């Protein structure tokens, strides 16, 4: 006679929940618990709804109850683990998942959640193993399948790549059509060939998650400022980010807040992360007009209240669908204008985002349908890097002519340093090669060059020559850790050699320092063609992660490349990573997802970068950087043009010297690394948006001055 009154109420609550009547769902659940307090299923369902609402504490209460009533409730163990994981109790979530797997060895969801924990912690083989186990238990598991696909992309395991991609598109279509949450994360949707509508829709659903979480607050709409009267005519701009610290975003824009014009702007910085003690956070705190630690205010309602009370006119989302994001603050709309700027290379798909700050090269109006927001164009490029501030020691270089009778090489033994000129002025016979006010000094093979090479070869940390401090490029962390992270400018003269990284002393070096997930079989095919067409040339990659290295090599061997044609290096500290890019000849950008910060890094080294812009924002950033640089010859309209440009740079050494010098000059001459100019143009765009809103208009595309 299984049906009871409580069973009926729990069902009716399930129906109202699938209808989207979440409040009626919780009311009916609670009524069912009233009829039957020891109703384990009602406890579990109410806990699931509460966890979806963000009421994690009460949800954990109800999950623990439901598991008290039914100790074999494996699903309740798995969902309690999920709630504890959302509460940052990773140990408790792990225990929940393993207890569920112990109780029911056939339960796939717990295996998938364990794989999720492994993947979050960086154990990709373990995550792959547990995802495979879950899919073996439950072959139709879209979440496990998509997460496994991302793990394989991370490690560059392209076995059955085409079938995997087609299944991914089919799964996304099926879940969109059935109004379930898509199993592909928006940040990953740029790596798969979905329609631009598919990517926009995934972004929309993930923003709807934030909307559902903020609805429980029942906050009224905020009264937004209609003029700048209360702020002395200053536009109040608040940058919201979890990356004020040692994070790439700070490496891009840390100088921007201090360069804002105080007469017309008031700069607020809302950190979603605690102080990590690094100089990036210190700089942002000390240069912004106001720093607000929203990490002390976990309640999205109260943090949105603080943003509103500060009187922000333009709120800037620099997190998007990345880690540490709190888009719930933006879903509460505490500011009249809300704009996506820098950290997320994609659309938010969400209504609470008015603008996305981009440029004509990254997002031409033709593809304005990819983005839910209105386009707000920067004059040259929306990308910026702080390299001129973080690494001024790479503005000039010098080399040693190790190969006694060797035409001058610019990237085999390189020296950098703030005091390099004084050191060279202490040297007897420095030769000065003019590059067509810019020049490269060359140290001939003296006892001094022999001492430097001995320091490099013997693996010594540092030496002294004529009272000057000479440092091994591999020993920066041992000399000044702050210098290695980019928190400080190095105070010694650093030596970087190809011998340090196994690069050919006599061959062309193609480099790509991006995370290996940006590589797909088509990209490796193009690189293989380029390597075949250029003799002795090698490709320089990073162990990013190291478990991806064998995969690449295996595939590279099937295409006819010996293991010696690809040189892998470990990931280095930031300063060493940017510095060692000088050793390469040409960088080959990933077409599937361009190197964005990596592109800035390689261009700062003076290394020409070849890109093929795609359709997604992430696939066109390198092209936009190259246009802003003034190097249109490095942008390819197709795969064949990409390969042709790469092999021309590799084989025509005079053209290679010309283009390398062009990049070496344009990285200073162009606005690409000019943070003051970028801040001023961003201020122009800000005032454009504010005047458009102040005239009573709804947000619209902002192009032309």
């Amino acid at each position: 006679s299984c049906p009871t009154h409580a069973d009926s109420l729990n069902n009716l609550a399930n129906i109202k929940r699938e209808q989207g009547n979440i409040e009626e769902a919780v009311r009916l659940y609670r009524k069912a618990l009233e009829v039957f307090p020891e109703f384990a299923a009602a406890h579990s369902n109410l806990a699931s709804v509460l966890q979806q609402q963000g009421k994690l504490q009460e949800a954990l209460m109800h999950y623990k109850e439901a598991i008290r009533i039914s100790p074999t409730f494996a699903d309740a163990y798995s969902n309690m683990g999920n709630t504890l994981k959302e509460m940052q109790d990773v140990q408790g979530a792990l225990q929940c998942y393993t207890r569920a797997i112990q109780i029911n060895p056939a339960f796939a969801d717990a295996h998938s959640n364990l794989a999720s924990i492994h993947k979050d912690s960086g154990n990709i083989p373990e995550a792959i193993a547990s995802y495979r186990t879950a899919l073996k238990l439950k072959p139709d598991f879209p979440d496990a399948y998509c997460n496994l696909a991302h793990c394989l992309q991370i490690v560059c395991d392209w076995t059955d790549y085409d079938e995997r991609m087609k299944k991914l598109v089919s799964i996304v279509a099926d879940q969109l059509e059935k109004n379930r949450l898509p199993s592909v994360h928006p940040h990953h949707s740029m790596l798969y060939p979905l329609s631009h509508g598919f990517r926009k829709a995934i972004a929309e659903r993930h923003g709807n998650l934030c909307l559902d979480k903020i609805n429980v607050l029942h906050k009224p709409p905020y009264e937004h400022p209609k003029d700048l009267k209360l702020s002395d005519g200053r536009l109040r701009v608040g940058y919201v980010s979890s990356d004020f610290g040692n994070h790439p975003t700070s490496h891009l824009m840390q100088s921007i807040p201090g360069m804002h014009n105080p007469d017309k702007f008031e700069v607020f910085c809302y950190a979603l992360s605690p102080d990590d003690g690094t100089n990036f956070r210190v700089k942002v705190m000390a240069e912004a007009n106001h720093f607000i630690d929203l990490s002390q205010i976990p309640c999205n309602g109260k943090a949105a209240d603080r943003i509103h009370q500060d009187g922000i006119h333009i709120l800037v989302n620099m997190n998007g669908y990345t880690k540490g994001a709190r888009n719930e603050l933006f879903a509460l709309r505490p500011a009249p204008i809300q704009a996506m700027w820098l950290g997320y290379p994609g659309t938010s798909g969400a209504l609470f985002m008015d603008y996305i700050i981009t440029d004509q090269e990254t997002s031409p109006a033709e593809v304005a349908e990819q983005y839910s927001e209105k386009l707000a164009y920067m004059p040259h490029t929306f990308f910026i890097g702080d390299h001129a501030n973080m690494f001024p020691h790479l503005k000039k270089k010098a080399v040693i002519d190790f190969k006694s009778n060797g035409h001058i090489y610019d990237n085999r033994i390189v020296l950098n340093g703030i005091d390099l000129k004084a050191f060279l002025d202490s040297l007897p016979d420095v030769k000065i090669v003019k590059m067509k006010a810019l020049n490269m000094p060359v140290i001939p093979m003296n006892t001094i060059a022999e001492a430097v090479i001995e320091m490099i070869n013997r693996g010594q940390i540092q030496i002294t020559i004529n009272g000057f401090s000479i440092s091994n490029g591999l020993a920066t962390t041992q000399i000044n850790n702050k210098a290695a992270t980019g928190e400080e400018v190095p105070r010694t003269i650093i030596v970087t050699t190809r011998s340090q990284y196994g690069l050919p002393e006599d061959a062309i070096v193609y480099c790509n320092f991006n995370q290996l997930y940006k590589i797909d079989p088509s990209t490796l095919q193009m690189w293989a063609n380029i390597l075949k067409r250029v003799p002795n040339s090698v490709l320089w990659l990073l162990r990013f992660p190291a478990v991806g290295e064998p995969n690449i090599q295996q595939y590279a061997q099937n295409m006819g490349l010996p293991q010696n044609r690809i040189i892998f290096s470990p990931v280095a500290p930031k300063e060493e990573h940017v510095r060692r890019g000088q050793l390469a000849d040409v960088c080959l950008d990933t077409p599937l997802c361009n190197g964005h910060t990596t592109g800035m890094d390689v261009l700062w080294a003076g290394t020409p970068m070849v890109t093929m812009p795609g359709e997604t924002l992430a696939s066109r950033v390198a092209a936009s950087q190259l246009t802003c640089l003034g190097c249109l010859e490095l942008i390819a309209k197709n795969r064949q043009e990409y390969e042709d440009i790469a092999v021309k740079l590799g084989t025509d050494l005079e053209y290679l010297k010309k283009v390398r010098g062009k990049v070496w000059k344009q990285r200073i001459s162009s606005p690409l690394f000019n943070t003051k100019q970028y801040t001023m143009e961003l201020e122009r765009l800000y005032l454009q948006m504010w005047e458009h809103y102040a005239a009573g208009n709804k947000p619209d595309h902002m192009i032309k001055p």
């Binding site: 090479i453 070869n457 693996g459 010594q460 940390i461 591999l474 050699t497 011998s499 340090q500």
Partner: peptide
């Protein structure tokens, strides 16, 4: 061995 030791030596 040592983190500063190079991959190969120069002539």
């Amino acid at each position: 061995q040592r983190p500063t030791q190079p991959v190969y030596q120069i002539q």
